[PDB]
Each structure stands twice: as structure tokens, then as C-alpha cells.
Design a protein around this ligand. Structure first.
Ligand SMILES: O=C(/C=C/c1ccc(O)cc1)c1ccccc1
Ligand SMILES: O=C(/C=C/c1ccc(O)cc1)c1ccccc1
Ligand SMILES: O=C(/C=C/c1ccc(O)cc1)c1ccccc1
Lengths: 116, 117, 115, 117
């Protein structure tokens, strides 16, 4: 139901071991921790939640791009990359958040699909 | 010293009248308002601050992409686009933050130049 | 060994049924057809070639973006999206060419891995 | 009428001194040279053509990304970045082709404007 994929545009490789922290916005307007993990050898992060755990709300996906670059000896521009979105419609959809990284640029896309 | 440029990848045009809110991170770890404005006819936002007002710190540039799309009758994916970065940490630089928008995707880049060259 | 993935940045979906034509540059500096296909329900195109068919050379991956947009009633800017690169020059690699599409913009990335 | 802007996503800078070659497609389906230049200190290339010279047709803008990276000691993926498009098909327009570069990735976008406003 929720997948994150991260790619490295400088090395032409998946971005491996990247820390990802997901939050859900709570009634008090604060961000509550929801799920977290590290990207795999293929730059993917799977099994963050279940269909029933992943309910309607505003989510924040935070990707620790600064530590990723610093660990390669590169000094990047951004503190991190954040993605905030309504999984308004979330349980009956699958969400893939993709991010492509460079030291001074990033881009992000969402692929949202229905299991019919 | 701080310029924002926004482009619309669907219409192939500058993204006009887009709300931009800048914050500075305060000692207490909360975001304090710093400057705000709307993109011009060319998708640019100038004169947000001065060299002297624009001090060392962590800034957040928040672009109200959701309203932009909604006003064109499109239901977008993201609540906004945010750019967080450390500025002026090795002396005064001019920053341009560029953003390219689509309903389900965005990309952002920084061009940092030294006024001493 | 060679995969193409295409995404639609407007609808937030894989770009389905997109025509992809691959060429290899021949000695006479003309583009010789090499493989071709349509993107699947997942926006992917697999099994285009084999490790031994896919030899050292300069390849061109051509994505028919114009027809994709026109079929959705949108009049796009580019005739197509082309990706030209040298492959297998330093021994066999697996290549994924990804493309993200909008009417007036596209971006492309390569993921190259060693088995 | 035709402007090219190139940015370096690794250094957060304009991409300077980048070779750009523009072609027009001829009746025999071959690419005829049309204009060429190097990006300036701001990553821009101006004055490639005139309104009168810049006629209806299919153009190719070719950016020599491989030599750019190689001159910075980096071994890139692409031979170049090409943009192919139909211009002035419904009368005169002003075209800006923008490109953002990384060793293994690039993105390109067009801003097309009408001087008739
Ligand atoms: O090329 C431009 C195109 C501008 C434009 C403005 C409005 C519009 O609807 C379409 C294009 C331009 C003009 C001034 C500064 C920067 C860029
Ligand atoms: O967002 C992307 C997503 C790529 C992707 C790759 C594999 C996959 O399973 C899902 C998404 C992307 C692709 C090309 C250029 C810039 C960004
Ligand atoms: O903001 C941009 C570049 C700004 C800039 C500022 C200073 C400098 O020296 C070079 C480029 C830009 C312009 C056209 C399309 C997309 C982005």
C-alpha cells in the first residue's frame, strides 16, 4: 500500500540505505510518527504499513537526503526532502512515492493505483 | 538575494500568482515567518528580503502548489512543495529556488551564486 | 538487460501503452532498428533483448510521447523523447531507462547495475 | 525568439560553456545545421536566430552534455541531450528550452510565449 523508491542521479543507481520517516497529521495539528525504514539494495522501502493501518489522512514522507550525500563525501543543498499529501482516499489506493536525487536538486512523483 | 521562480509543466508557461511563504527556523525549533509573496506574470518573486535582513540560518520555502492547481480546476496530489536549506553559512550568497510543477510531481533546484565574482 | 519505465506526471499513473523504439548506431552513422514494444499496465517494457544480442554500441531509445498525450486529448510540445547512450562499453551491465512525462516537459534517468 | 538555458544540478550553478547545436529537418529527412553557440556565464544562449530566419519546421536542439561533464572529470551516461519539436506551426512564438543536468539524468522543459499577447 505505501512504497518509497529513491534514485541517485549522479551515480545512476538506486539510493541505498536512505532513511525515510513517515508521519500522519493528528487532530492537534502536530505530526505523529507513523512508519519508518531504510531503503533496500534496490532503493525501495516496502511493508511500511497495511491496508487497514493506512487510513484516511494527511501524510508526510520525509527522506534524509542530507545524510545520504554526506556519507558519500558530498555537501548537499537541502536538509531533506519532504512530501506531504492526502491519502484522502488511501485504503482503497496503492501509493508509490518516487524521488530522484542530486546534491542541489530533487524531484518527486507519485504513482497512485487502484486494486480495481 | 532570494528569488523564487515557478514553472508550469502542463501548460508550458510560468506559474503565475502562486503563493510563496518563507520561514526561518528559530532557536526554539519552530518556524518563524520571514517573507511572503505571489509569483509575477513571469513566474518570479523578487524583493522578498535584503542582504542585511537575510541572515545565516535554516530557511523553509513553501510553495502553495495545491491552490495553483485547484484554481485551474485540477485536483493535485501534494499539499504543497517545500524546500528546506541552510543559507549564508559561509557568507552572503544570492539564492534562486526554481520549481517545476505538475499535478502529481514536482522538481526543485537551487542556483547559488557569489556576488563576489 | 534493458528495461524501459514510463510515468505520467499529470495523472500520477504509469504511462500505459506508450510506443518505444530502440535503435543501434551502425558504422554508416545511421540508426538501425534493434527492438521495439509498448509499455505494459505498469508502464514497463521488458524482454526487449538478451545479454548476447545486446552488444557494445551507442543506443537510442525513442519514446512516442506525442501520441500518448494526443490520445488523452492533449497537445504536447515534443515530437518524442529520445535517450542516446553508450552501452556495455566496459562489459555487460543491466540498464533501466526511466522517463517521467508532462505535456511540456520530460525528464529521464538511467539506473545502471552490474550483475 | 529562441533561447536555451542550462543548469547544473550537482554544483547548483548555471552550466557554463556548454555547446548547443540547433538543426532544422530538411525535405530529405536529414538534419540541416541552423544555429549554434556556447552557453554564457549565466548558462544562457541568446541571439541564435531572428523572427524572420526562424521559420516553421521541426527543430532539433542538441546539447553537448557529455563534453561538459568530461571537462569536470566526470564520466556521464548520455552522449548528449536532444530536444525535438515543431515550431511556429500556428504562427510566430518565442521559445525557451531549459535543461537541468546530472551525470546520469536530465530533464527538459519548454516555455512557449506569444508576442501577440
Ligand atoms: O520569456 C519569458 C516569458 C514570459 C511569459 C509571461 C507570461 C506568459 O503568459 C507567458 C510567458 C520571460 C519574460 C520576462 C522574464 C522572464 C521570462
Ligand atoms: O520519479 C521517478 C520515478 C521512477 C521510478 C522507477 C521505478 C519504479 O518502480 C517506480 C518509479 C523519476 C523517473 C525518471 C526521472 C525522474 C523521476
Ligand atoms: O530561475 C532560473 C535561473 C536563475 C539564475 C539566477 C542567477 C544565475 O546566475 C543563473 C540563473 C530559471 C530560468 C528559466 C527557467 C528555469 C529556471
Amino acid at each position: 500500500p505505501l512504497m518509497v523508491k529513491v534514485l541517485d542521479a549522479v551515480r545512476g543507481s538506486p539510493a541505498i540505505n536512505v532513511a525515510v520517516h513517515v508521519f500522519r497529521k493528528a487532530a492537534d495539528d502536530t505530526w505523529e510518527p507513523f512508519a519508518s525504514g531504510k531503503t533496500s539494495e534496490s532503493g525501495e522501502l516496502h511493508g511500511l504499513t497495511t491496508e487497514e493501518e493506512f487510513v484516511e489522512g494527511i501524510y508526510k514522507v520525509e527522506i534524509d537526503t542530507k545524510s545520504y550525500w554526506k556519507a558519500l563525501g558530498i555537501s548537499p543543498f537541502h536538509e531533506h526532502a519532504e512530501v506531504v499529501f492526502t491519502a484522502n482516499d488511501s485504503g482503497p489506493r496503492r501509493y508509490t512515492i518516487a524521488a530522484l536525487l542530486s546534491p542541489y536538486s530533487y524531484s518527486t512523483t507519485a504513482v497512485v493505483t487502484n486494486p480495481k
